[PDB]
């Protein structure tokens, strides 16, 4: 996020970090339940990757996070690598996340729902804050 | 780097697809929703994270960070996968596994 601001630790409890086998963040995700994480198809997540829940300051030596293993990756079959259309993958976790103060789910909208243009919304992440 | 240690946040406006095509043209498909162009930009490493709007007191997933300006330009809207358009597949999938 360019021109964002540091969130309060634990204020976005559904936010997870998808890390490779060697511990490097490569994409974000959201817990929608204790056993499933939704992310983008383009992130090309594998069962080798790990989901870090409850994290705030990645630069830590530790805080009370959870490293969850991925049992199966469900990439949308309509995902089009060319147009980046239908860009969603679901991750089924090997072991369920333990909900707490700092780890809980985001709600899913109904397909019928409308979010009007002009509405202020929020985005979160550990992306670069400068290009 | 420019790659933060601490989680960052930003609030930003949703755009209509019609206004979003004013920036991205035909690259904008039914399953995408745009937001931003307001002085903030999602950038490298934010991909797959949430775009949430309050819905009855509760934060709801409206978009997933997908793509944006190759320079992380704060005057161009970011593009998010439109959850409302993919939620039947989400539910069908959960129900089957």
């Amino acid at each position: 996020i360019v021109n964002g601001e540091e969130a309060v630790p634990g204020s976005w409890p559904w936010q997870v970090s998808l890390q490779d086998k060697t511990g490097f963040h490569f994409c974000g995700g959201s817990l929608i339940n204790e056993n499933w994480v939704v992310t983008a198809a383009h992130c090309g997540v594998t069962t080798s990757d790990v989901v870090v829940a409850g994290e705030f300051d990645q630069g830590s030596s530790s805080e009370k996070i959870q490293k969850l293993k991925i049992a199966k990756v469900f990439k949308n079959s309509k995902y089009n690598s060319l147009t980046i259309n239908n860009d969603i993958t679901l991750l089924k976790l090997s072991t369920a996340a333990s909900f707490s103060q700092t780890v809980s789910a985001v709600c899913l909208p109904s397909a019928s729902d409308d979010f009007a243009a002009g509405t202020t919304c929020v985005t979160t992440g550990w992306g670069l804050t400068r290009y | 780097a420019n790659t933060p240690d601490r989680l960052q946040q930003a609030s930003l406006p949703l755009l209509s697809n019609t206004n979003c095509k004013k920036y991205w043209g035909t690259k904008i498909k039914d399953a995408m929703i745009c937001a931003g162009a307001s002085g903030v930009s999602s950038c490298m490493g934010d991909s797959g994270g949430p775009l949430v709007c309050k819905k009855n007191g509760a934060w709801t997933l409206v978009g997933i960070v997908s793509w944006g300006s190759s320079t992380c330009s704060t005057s161009t809207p970011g593009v998010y996968a439109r959850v409302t358009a993919l939620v039947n597949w989400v539910q069908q999938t959960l129900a089957a596994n």
Binding site: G10, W12, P13, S100, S104, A105 | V52, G57, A58, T60
Partner: peptide, 10 residues
């Protein structure tokens, strides 16, 4: 879902 125990400050 969607109500953090820790409230965000935006």
């Amino acid at each position: 879902c969607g109500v953090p125990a820790i409230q965000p400050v935006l």
